Design a protein around this nucleic acid. Structure first.
Lengths: 476, 683
DNA sequence: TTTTTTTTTTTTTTTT
DNA sequence: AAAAAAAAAAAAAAA
């Protein structure tokens, strides 16, 4: 049956293939069904034969093209084929889908939308055809009326994002939109619908959706993606804290959304500026509720990107002193205790990060150590060698030692990085007051000399410097 | 130093990985490519010696370099990635997800890097020990299929290059079904832009000629290529075909030892008239040539008819009577001559390596056909300068897009190196009794190739070392005969004292000396591996006087070679070729008292006549004289005494002729002479 | 953040 | 009368 189609397609076009096409009018469905039953290469051969035998100048062949489009679109999902014929079908349709007027592509896109609403896309490999069609509506300068074809693309995108999406096709519907030339408003619609779809999914299918959102962010809308993922996982952290009143699921999910946002900041140095601007506490004085144990772990991981290190550590330093000023102001007055309901402070959030980091978050903990020693180095005493210069600086410097002492206990690899840096500040400074480092070294030692006999030589190399120290430092 | 540092002390260095990677990254952001090479080596050794966490940090760093990037840093990172997939693909496979993720960021990347990128990704992909993570196959297929299926040619070229690159790497029977399905997809997407199909043919051809790979898909495709060519262009030799043409259409430029009332002839004018598929003639013939060289191992037994078949062209007589018409028909003629020249260049590229002597005669007739069409086309460009027939080379010039000096190297098909097997033959002279412009053409090509390589698509995938290695055979013991025959011509031309013969041979002499200068100024001779090639090369230059003194010391071969070379200074017609001779002698004598020869020879060129043709004195232009007097004034032992010689003859210019007892001394030349005089006085 | 040096471009003058 | 060469001024990059 197919051999006469090949023999008419061999020599010339649109002179015998059209005439054979007006003999057999129906039953191309079961033809392609038995064709995929026998061989997929023959199906691609017949698709090329039909597509060259049915030009788009005449209007009789366009209906055969539409019917074979709906046939292949249903069989690429529903029909359990072999993979190569699937690739050849989608490649052939994607190639030949240029040559059309407006409304045929429009009703194709409407069939796609109406399918992805209700119709069980058995796999959903037909979706790859969808952006190509919309891309042709971007370049179809043939006028429509209901409009420009680009406006039909805007309306179809709005109809797709406003309607319900199925749970299984949010990764594929976001990955599709990476290839449509979108403006700001369309990509904000796509990210808004996609961020809306987070609560109705498996947790383990949130990191790749975040990844497609982060590569798709680069077009318009960075603030919305960052605000969305920080807000969603801050809410999850808080619900987990109330339920404690998944954790290796939640921590291994946040420990892969954090790397995605760090890598996307490395490849794109404006996603990092958007993250730093969106989280900064010092807007004028006021502490924001955008900081949480998630959103602070993300700042500590972005400190290993070398352009953001000083900027993010200085941000967390001013974000800790502001918290202690606020807490001192409330604790000194009942009138403020009546109004303000008891807020978690940045101190408690940081000490939650250090607890959380036990599992796999080694990326975070080299930034915890740097914040610890920035808090202690910057806020240690000097005035003995008052409340405002003293009590929110005493409380930050003792937050530092708490960061380093709790980080020292559980992270068995940044011993000798705290302990040779505590000692290096005790030994070498010896003119500036260093009581805080001797307190911290006393705590670190006293806690477990059983865990310091595995990192002991850092001690006995500071014994050789004991002669040149002042006497009180040697006694202490 | 860095190799010894890492390879000995990689236990001291291990615990400080991250600082090294913070260093390496700063030595890729710089210019000054020795620094960038250093940074590249830091990433290579950090990957090679450290443990499996630092390898992942290395690959992440290179991926950030590629994606974020600027041009040279991207190229360097792709070079390092090729070395890392060659070196240890096991530890590079564990970091396949980073490298797969490059595909989301291909807008920054330019298509000379895209070929390398898909090389890396396919070389990661097609190892049978990790078929279970075939996700990068799926993502590569997707980005290929989304590019290929696009109206925008800037994406379509990405698709074509990545597609055929995947195809070439997966060719080392199911796999053959995969390759043929992919290539059929590329063919289908290319068929309906012409230059897209041209780029397909070109890049597929480059894939054949660079990688030979398991020849199962090649013999699969070539049985379609030969048939498609022989029905696409091959017409039975009927004089006038159908169609309404205001031009007498014949079968021109047939070799005529072929019977005229025969089969194969090639349709051009009904094709290009139907356009207003002929633009793909030369690359498709290149593809046909390469697949039949892969099949029959260099034999072209069914394609010898392509060498001598007439071409269905209009009357390509110089249309000076066809003036006042610079309409679209003028562009038709210019594009026609352009296309047949590219076709002819592909023929002479095709049949140059063959050793049959009547076929060599056919090739030489093809070359003289080429030069006649070139002078006709430059006549047609002298008609109209504005009518560009824009068909660049598809690798670099087309993405730049999407008088005779530009199109001489950018527009025409590029000659191969083996085309210089032709000049084994000796010149014949038409006036005194392989012609002089048929040698001028090849030497004008070879000079441009040597200056491009040592100081151009198919050339630059060969290393400079293999280029100069094949130049050593295919120039020196072959062009020495042409040099000596030229010397014999200019001796008789001096004894006698038409003009176009001598005018062409002067440029032939100039190009021979320019090729010699470009060859012997090769900086790779400075490195201790290549002096044995010098112990070959100047030995052959030594062998033009006397043989028998084998295994000689170096400076003896230098002295014999310069003693051979000096004597040409009597037969030098012009100034620039003299400058090239003396600069050649300079750069060969820097391998060794020597200044006396150069100073005497510069004095000989200064006291030589150099006759008073207007364009001839124009070739004694200011900068060339400036360079020559810099050579003379620097290479004299007595600089101030030479200044007294020049100022002693600097005074009789006004007393004899308003032209001296020391020529190259006019009123106009004294600006140059004065400037070089007091400049060298200052130095 | 500032200064110097090199490279490129533009103009002017001289020559064919 | 047009073209080429040379110098001077301005821009850009590096310490």
């Amino acid at each position: 049956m197919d051999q006469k189609i090949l023999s008419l397609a061999a020599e010339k076009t649109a002179d015998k293939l059209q005439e054979f096409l007006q003999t057999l009018r129906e039953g191309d469905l079961t033809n392609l069904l038995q064709n995929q039953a026998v061989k997929g290469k023959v199906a691609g051969a017949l698709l090329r034969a039909i597509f060259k035998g049915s030009p788009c100048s005449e209007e009789a062949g366009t209906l055969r093209r539409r019917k074979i489009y709906t046939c292949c679109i249903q069989l690429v999902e529903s029909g359990d084929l072999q993979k190569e014929i699937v690739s050849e079908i989608i490649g052939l349709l994607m190639l030949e889908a240029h040559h059309f007027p407006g409304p045929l592509l429009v009703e194709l896109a409407n069939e796609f939308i109406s399918a992805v609403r209700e119709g069980s896309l058995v796999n959903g490999k037909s979706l790859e055809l969808l952006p190509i069609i919309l891309t042709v509506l971007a370049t179809k300068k043939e006028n429509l009326a209901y409009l420009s074809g680009e406006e039909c693309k805007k309306q179809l995108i709005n109809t797709l994002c406003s309607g319900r999406w199925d749970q299984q096709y949010v990764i594929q519907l976001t990955s599709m939109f990476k290839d449509v030339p979108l403006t700001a408003e369309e990509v904000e619609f796509v990210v808004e619908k996609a961020l809306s779809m987070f609560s109705k999914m498996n947790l383990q299918e949130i990191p790749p959706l975040v990844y497609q959102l982060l590569v798709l962010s680069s077009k318009g809308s960075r603030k919305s993606v960052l605000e969305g993922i920080i807000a969603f996982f801050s809410a999850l952290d808080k619900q987990h804290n109330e339920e404690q009143s998944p954790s290796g699921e939640l921590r291994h999910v946040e420990g892969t959304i954090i790397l995605h946002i760090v890598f996307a900041i490395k490849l794109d140095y404006e996603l990092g500026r958007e993250l730093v601007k969106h989280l900064k506490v010092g807007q004028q004085g006021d502490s924001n509720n955008n900081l949480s144990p998630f959103s602070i772990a993300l700042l500590l991981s972005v400190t290993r990107i070398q352009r953001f290190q000083d900027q993010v550590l200085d941000l967390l330093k001013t974000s800790v002193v502001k918290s202690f000023k606020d807490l001192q102001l409330l604790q000194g007055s009942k009138f403020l205790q009546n109004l303000v309901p008891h807020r978690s402070y940045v101190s408690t959030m940081i000490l939650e990060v250090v607890k959380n980091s036990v599992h796999s978050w080694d990326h975070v903990t080299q930034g915890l150590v740097e914040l610890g020693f920035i808090l202690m180095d910057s806020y240690g005493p000097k005035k003995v060698l008052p409340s405002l210069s003293r009590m929110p600086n005493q409380h930050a410097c003792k937050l530092g030692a708490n960061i380093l002492l709790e980080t020292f206990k559980i992270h068995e690899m940044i011993r000798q990085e705290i302990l040779e840096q505590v000692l290096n500040r005790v030994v070498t400074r010896a003119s500036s007051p260093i009581s805080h480092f001797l307190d911290l070294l006393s705590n670190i030692v006293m806690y477990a000399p059983l865990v310091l006999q595995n990192c002991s030589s850092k001690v006995t190399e500071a014994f050789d410097y004991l002669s040149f120290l002042p006497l009180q430092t040697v006694q202490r | 130093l860095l190799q010894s540092t890492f390879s000995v002390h990689y236990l001291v260095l291990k615990d400080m990985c991250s600082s090294i990677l913070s260093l390496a990254q700063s030595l890729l952001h710089s210019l000054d490519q020795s620094i960038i090479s250093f940074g590249s080596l830091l990433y290579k050794y950090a990957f090679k010696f450290f443990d499996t966490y630092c390898q992942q940090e290395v690959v992440g760093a290179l991926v950030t370099h590629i994606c974020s990037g600027n041009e040279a840093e991207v190229d360097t990172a792709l070079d390092v990635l090729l070395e890392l997939v060659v070196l240890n693909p096991s530890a590079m496979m564990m970091n396949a997800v980073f490298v797969k993720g490059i595909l989301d960021y291909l807008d920054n990347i330019s298509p000379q890097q895209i070929r390398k990128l898909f090389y890396v990704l396919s070389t990661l992909a097609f190892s049978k020990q990790n078929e279970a993570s075939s996700h990068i196959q799926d993502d590569m297929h997707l980005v290929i299929r989304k590019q290929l299926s696009s109206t925008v040619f800037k994406y379509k070229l990405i698709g074509i290059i990545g597609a055929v690159t995947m195809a070439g790497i997966m060719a080392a029977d199911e796999q053959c079904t995969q390759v043929t399905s992919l290539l059929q997809l590329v063919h289908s997407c290319s068929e309906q832009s012409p230059q897209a199909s041209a780029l397909y043919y070109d890049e597929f051809a480059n894939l054949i000629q660079h990688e030979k790979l398991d020849p199962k898909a090649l013999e699969w495709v070539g049985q379609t290529i030969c048939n498609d060519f022989q029905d696409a262009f091959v017409v039975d030799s009927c004089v006038v075909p159908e169609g309404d043409f205001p031009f007498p259409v014949k079968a021109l430029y047939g070799l005529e030892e072929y019977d005229t009332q025969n089969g194969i002839a090639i349709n051009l004018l009904p094709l290009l008239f139907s356009q207003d598929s002929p633009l793909c003639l030369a690359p498709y013939f290149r593809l046909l040539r390469l697949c039949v060289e892969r099949q029959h191992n260099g034999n072209l037994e069914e394609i010898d008819g392509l060498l001598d078949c007439p071409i269905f062209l209009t009357d390509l007589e110089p249309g000076e009577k066809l003036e006042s018409m610079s309409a679209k028909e003028r562009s038709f003629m210019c594009s026609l001559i352009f296309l047949t020249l590219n076709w002819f260049r592909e023929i002479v590229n095709a049949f140059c390596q063959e050793t049959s002597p009547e076929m060599k005669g056919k090739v030489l007739t093809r070359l003289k056909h080429i030069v006649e069409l070139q002078i006709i086309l430059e006549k047609y460009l002298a008609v109209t300068p504005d009518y560009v027939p824009p068909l660049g080379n598809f690798d670099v010039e087309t993405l730049d897009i999407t008088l005779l000096l530009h199109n001489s190297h950018a527009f025409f098909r590029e000659l191969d190196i083996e085309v210089f097997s032709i000049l084994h033959c000796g010149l014949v002279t038409k006036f005194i009794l392989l012609g002089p412009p048929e040698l001028l053409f090849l030497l004008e090509d070879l000079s441009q190739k040597l200056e491009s390589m040592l100081t151009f698509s198919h050339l630059q995938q060969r290393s400079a070392q293999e280029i100069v290695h094949c130049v050593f055979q295919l120039l020196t013991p072959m062009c020495n005969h042409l040099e000596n025959i030229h010397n014999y011509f200019q001796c008789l031309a001096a004894e006698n004292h038409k003009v176009q013969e001598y005018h062409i041979m002067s440029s032939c002499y100039q190009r021979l000396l320019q090729i010699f200068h470009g060859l012997f100024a090769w900086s790779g001779f400075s490195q201790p591996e290549n002096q044995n090639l010098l112990y070959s090369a100047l030995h052959v230059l030594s062998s033009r006087l006397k043989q028998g003194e084998h295994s000689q010391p170096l400076e003896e071969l230098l002295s014999q070679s310069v003693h051979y070379l000096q004597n040409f200074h009597q037969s030098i017609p012009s100034f620039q070729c003299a400058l090239y001779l003396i600069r050649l002698l300079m750069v060969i004598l820097e391998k060794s008292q020597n200044k006396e020869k150069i100073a005497s020879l510069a004095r000989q060129f200064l006291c030589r006549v150099w006759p008073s043709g207007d364009k001839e004195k124009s070739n004694i232009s200011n900068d060339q004289l400036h360079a020559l007097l810099c050579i003379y004034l620097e290479h004299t032992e007595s600089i101030l005494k030479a200044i007294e010689e020049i100022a002693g003859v600097g005074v009789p210019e006004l007393i004899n002729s308003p032209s001296s007892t020391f020529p190259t001394l006019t009123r106009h030349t004294f600006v140059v002479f004065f400037r070089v005089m007091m400049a060298e006085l200052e130095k």
